[PDB]
Design an enzyme around this catalytic site. Sequence first.
Site, PDB file in Angstrom:
ATOM      1  N   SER A 132       0.816  -0.682   0.039  1.00  0.00           N
ATOM      2  CA  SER A 132      -0.361  -0.004  -0.006  1.00  0.00           C
ATOM      3  C   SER A 132       0.700   1.310   0.469  1.00  0.00           C
ATOM      4  O   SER A 132       2.040   1.408   0.178  1.00  0.00           O
ATOM      5  CB  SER A 132      -0.714   0.244   1.185  1.00  0.00           C
ATOM      6  OG  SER A 132      -0.105  -0.117   2.313  1.00  0.00           O
TER       7      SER A 132
ATOM      8  N   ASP B 263      -0.564  -1.384  -4.234  1.00  0.00           N
ATOM      9  CA  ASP B 263      -2.668  -1.478  -3.366  1.00  0.00           C
ATOM     10  C   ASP B 263      -2.764   0.198  -3.506  1.00  0.00           C
ATOM     11  O   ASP B 263      -2.101   1.152  -4.232  1.00  0.00           O
ATOM     12  CB  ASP B 263      -2.889  -1.610  -2.425  1.00  0.00           C
ATOM     13  CG  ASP B 263      -4.175  -1.723  -1.986  1.00  0.00           C
ATOM     14  OD1 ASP B 263      -4.811  -2.358  -2.475  1.00  0.00           O
ATOM     15  OD2 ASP B 263      -3.680  -2.116  -0.738  1.00  0.00           O
ATOM     16  N   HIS B 264      -4.038   0.379  -2.912  1.00  0.00           N
ATOM     17  CA  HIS B 264      -5.249   1.355  -3.169  1.00  0.00           C
ATOM     18  C   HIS B 264      -3.641   3.021  -3.564  1.00  0.00           C
ATOM     19  O   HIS B 264      -3.727   3.517  -2.953  1.00  0.00           O
ATOM     20  CB  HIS B 264      -5.880   2.192  -2.259  1.00  0.00           C
ATOM     21  CG  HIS B 264      -7.277   1.421  -2.277  1.00  0.00           C
ATOM     22  ND1 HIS B 264      -8.106   1.603  -1.791  1.00  0.00           N
ATOM     23  CD2 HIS B 264      -6.865  -0.283  -1.561  1.00  0.00           C
ATOM     24  CE1 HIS B 264      -8.730  -0.082  -1.571  1.00  0.00           C
ATOM     25  NE2 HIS B 264      -7.716  -0.628  -1.783  1.00  0.00           N
TER      26      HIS B 264
ATOM     27  N   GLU C 235     -11.524   1.046  -9.693  1.00  0.00           N
ATOM     28  CA  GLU C 235     -12.587   0.624  -8.944  1.00  0.00           C
ATOM     29  C   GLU C 235     -13.169   1.487  -9.468  1.00  0.00           C
ATOM     30  O   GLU C 235     -13.176   2.939  -9.583  1.00  0.00           O
ATOM     31  CB  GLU C 235     -12.240   1.080  -7.346  1.00  0.00           C
ATOM     32  CG  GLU C 235     -13.854   0.695  -6.790  1.00  0.00           C
ATOM     33  CD  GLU C 235     -12.959   0.296  -5.229  1.00  0.00           C
ATOM     34  OE1 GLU C 235     -11.900   0.668  -4.709  1.00  0.00           O
ATOM     35  OE2 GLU C 235     -13.750   0.252  -4.272  1.00  0.00           O
TER      36      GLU C 235
ATOM     37  N   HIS D  34     -12.941  -6.100  -1.908  1.00  0.00           N
ATOM     38  CA  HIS D  34     -11.866  -5.038  -1.174  1.00  0.00           C
ATOM     39  C   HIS D  34     -13.250  -5.812   0.465  1.00  0.00           C
ATOM     40  O   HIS D  34     -14.284  -5.463   0.370  1.00  0.00           O
ATOM     41  CB  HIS D  34     -11.875  -3.963  -1.308  1.00  0.00           C
ATOM     42  CG  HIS D  34     -11.192  -3.477  -2.839  1.00  0.00           C
ATOM     43  ND1 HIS D  34     -10.090  -3.370  -2.144  1.00  0.00           N
ATOM     44  CD2 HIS D  34     -11.515  -3.724  -3.575  1.00  0.00           C
ATOM     45  CE1 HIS D  34      -9.284  -3.165  -3.432  1.00  0.00           C
ATOM     46  NE2 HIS D  34     -10.172  -3.450  -4.168  1.00  0.00           N
ATOM     47  N   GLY D  35     -12.594  -5.527   1.614  1.00  0.00           N
ATOM     48  CA  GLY D  35     -13.903  -6.339   2.452  1.00  0.00           C
ATOM     49  C   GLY D  35     -13.493  -7.160   2.800  1.00  0.00           C
ATOM     50  O   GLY D  35     -14.171  -8.083   3.295  1.00  0.00           O
TER      51      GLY D  35
ATOM     52  N   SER E 181     -10.936  -9.687   5.267  1.00  0.00           N
ATOM     53  CA  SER E 181     -11.146  -9.868   6.430  1.00  0.00           C
ATOM     54  C   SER E 181     -12.501  -9.954   6.860  1.00  0.00           C
ATOM     55  O   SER E 181     -13.350  -8.446   6.898  1.00  0.00           O
ATOM     56  CB  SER E 181     -10.687  -8.701   7.286  1.00  0.00           C
ATOM     57  OG  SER E 181      -8.732  -9.210   6.951  1.00  0.00           O
TER      58      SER E 181
ATOM     59  N   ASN F   7      -8.651  -9.076  -1.112  1.00  0.00           N
ATOM     60  CA  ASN F   7      -7.367  -8.529  -0.104  1.00  0.00           C
ATOM     61  C   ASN F   7      -8.512  -8.772   1.343  1.00  0.00           C
ATOM     62  O   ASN F   7      -9.209  -8.625   2.019  1.00  0.00           O
ATOM     63  CB  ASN F   7      -7.659  -6.872   0.220  1.00  0.00           C
ATOM     64  CG  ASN F   7      -7.406  -6.245  -1.423  1.00  0.00           C
ATOM     65  OD1 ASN F   7      -6.443  -7.474  -2.597  1.00  0.00           O
ATOM     66  ND2 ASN F   7      -7.715  -4.809  -1.765  1.00  0.00           N
TER      67      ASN F   7
ATOM     68  N   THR G 244      -5.980  -6.138   7.607  1.00  0.00           N
ATOM     69  CA  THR G 244      -6.502  -5.945   9.204  1.00  0.00           C
ATOM     70  C   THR G 244      -6.118  -7.500   9.741  1.00  0.00           C
ATOM     71  O   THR G 244      -5.387  -7.381  11.239  1.00  0.00           O
ATOM     72  CB  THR G 244      -7.760  -5.967   9.461  1.00  0.00           C
ATOM     73  OG1 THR G 244      -8.096  -4.424   9.183  1.00  0.00           O
ATOM     74  CG2 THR G 244      -8.063  -6.266  11.193  1.00  0.00           C
TER      75      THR G 244
END
Lengths: 314, 314
Positions: free
Chosen positions: A52, A94-95, A160, A223-224, A226, A245, A248
């Site tokens: 990231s 990443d992002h 995205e 994404h999201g 975890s 991804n 966390t």
Amino acid sequence: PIATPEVYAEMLGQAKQNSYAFPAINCTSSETVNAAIKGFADAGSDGIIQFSTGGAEFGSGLGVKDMVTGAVALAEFTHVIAAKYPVNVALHTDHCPKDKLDSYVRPLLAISAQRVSKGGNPLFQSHMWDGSAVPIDENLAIAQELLKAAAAAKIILEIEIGYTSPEDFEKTIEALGAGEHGKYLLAATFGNLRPDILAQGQQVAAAKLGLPADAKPFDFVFHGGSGSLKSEIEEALRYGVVKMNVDTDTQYAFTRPIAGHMFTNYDGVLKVDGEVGVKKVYDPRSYLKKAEASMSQRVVQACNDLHCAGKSLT
Amino acid sequence: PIATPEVYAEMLGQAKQNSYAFPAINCTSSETVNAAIKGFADAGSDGIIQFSTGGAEFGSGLGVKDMVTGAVALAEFTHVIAAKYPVNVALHTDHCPKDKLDSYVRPLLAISAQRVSKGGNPLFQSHMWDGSAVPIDENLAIAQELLKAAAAAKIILEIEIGYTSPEDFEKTIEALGAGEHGKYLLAATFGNLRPDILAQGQQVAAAKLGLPADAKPFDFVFHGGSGSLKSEIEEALRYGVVKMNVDTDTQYAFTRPIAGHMFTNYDGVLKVDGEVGVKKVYDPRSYLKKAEASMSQRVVQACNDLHCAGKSLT
Ligand code: NA
Ligand code: NA
């Protein structure tokens, strides 16, 4: 080995076709890179490591604070370590929002483009343009010109868009094609749940391209990842989610033993009551090994959760 | 940038001429390498990073456990990073016994030998042969062939002999020469304290070579440099100590702020009483930035104590 563009694409192809996905672990150091690769290999599985903007800044060090040096530094280290494992690992960034394209993704694109013109592979195998926070139109405009850079540098772009609209998926196909002008991955906004937004997006694009209704033109990103419910993830995999991804959760698995080590050896990692501590426990490796091995156990758990466990191409 | 062999010898030369020495910091990861370099550049100093067999095994990860892979991987990392700093940074490997010559020191010499036949510079600038545990005769026979190989990769060789007697210094000169066979560093035994042992070796050596009494034919190294006394150190520097290994002290500096972070942020790095913790404080970067800055401060101190501060050749 690090994945060449050809095995990366074969990796994503084989996952799209058999409905499993690759865990993509955010890493910020040689320890955590080592844990992720060891996790993958342990689950007889290929995998993806990502950097990231935050994590890459951290990698160039406090005296440098430079994402590009950070990313390249880490990747170079990752190339040496990857060679000693049988599984294939793809490096991904990443992002990256708009205001950081000129100091992160465009610089890295030029680096790999330069390696590719010499007859080598690119440094990274994929980079994310994140235009989620701008008009889908302006997003696709920029996405277009990055895709030409990426494809030239044999790199897969991830983008995205924006619940994402049926017209959004159409605009995206219109603008980027469905792979003929460069392979790319799509992260759509579907409550990150409503995994059926992705199924809808796949038919919609198939209708427009004139393909069979079962054809899956997009490769999706989740994404999201975890904290997630197996049922929802199972469903998403069927609709062509190929990369998930995890950040966390690999953080907590990595820090949790360090915390433990510190408390239980409190009077040994600290010099207390005139004593001088115990060197065998304030040696960073004493707890960093516990950390790495804990993150590898969690990473393995994810390869089982996305059913890419045991499916390594090699 | 990384020290080329030319700058490296120029550094040690100036340090001997003017009675300062460099901290040689043990490193095991990307965080510690960034801390060390940042320390040097804050101190306005050239510096030395070194990888022990144990830390280099740690750098290759729990899933490879291979010294050479870890040294190379951490070294390519440092090459990228040191490029951003204005001070010269040399890369050294630490304590390598006879039964680890083949799996550590020699294959690394080979890697640099190939690198140097292609026009460029060695990956490391210096390598240690620790034969302290074998008779000086055998110790030095092995030193002689290693020094052949090391001088051919433009590499400085460090050796340890064994209190070291006047006779051992004479032997050492007799076997290695005083630079006509390539340059080498000498770590002798003298209670590591009796720094006068070093002055004695200089006299003995200078006499064998018909150089000035006050000559300083040897370049000495100082092991057991942590928990040392600031007047012991001054004396040793007068007698040609150019390099002092620090390990224990920089270790404690790294771990100290991590420990405090865990304790104070206890209910954030643990999920306690049904809570889910705070991601801001169990994010590895949060407390590794502390650790890294702490370690850097210790390095600035060592630079100050050894009088290399502000004496960078750039
Ligand atoms: Na060594
Ligand atoms: Na050494």
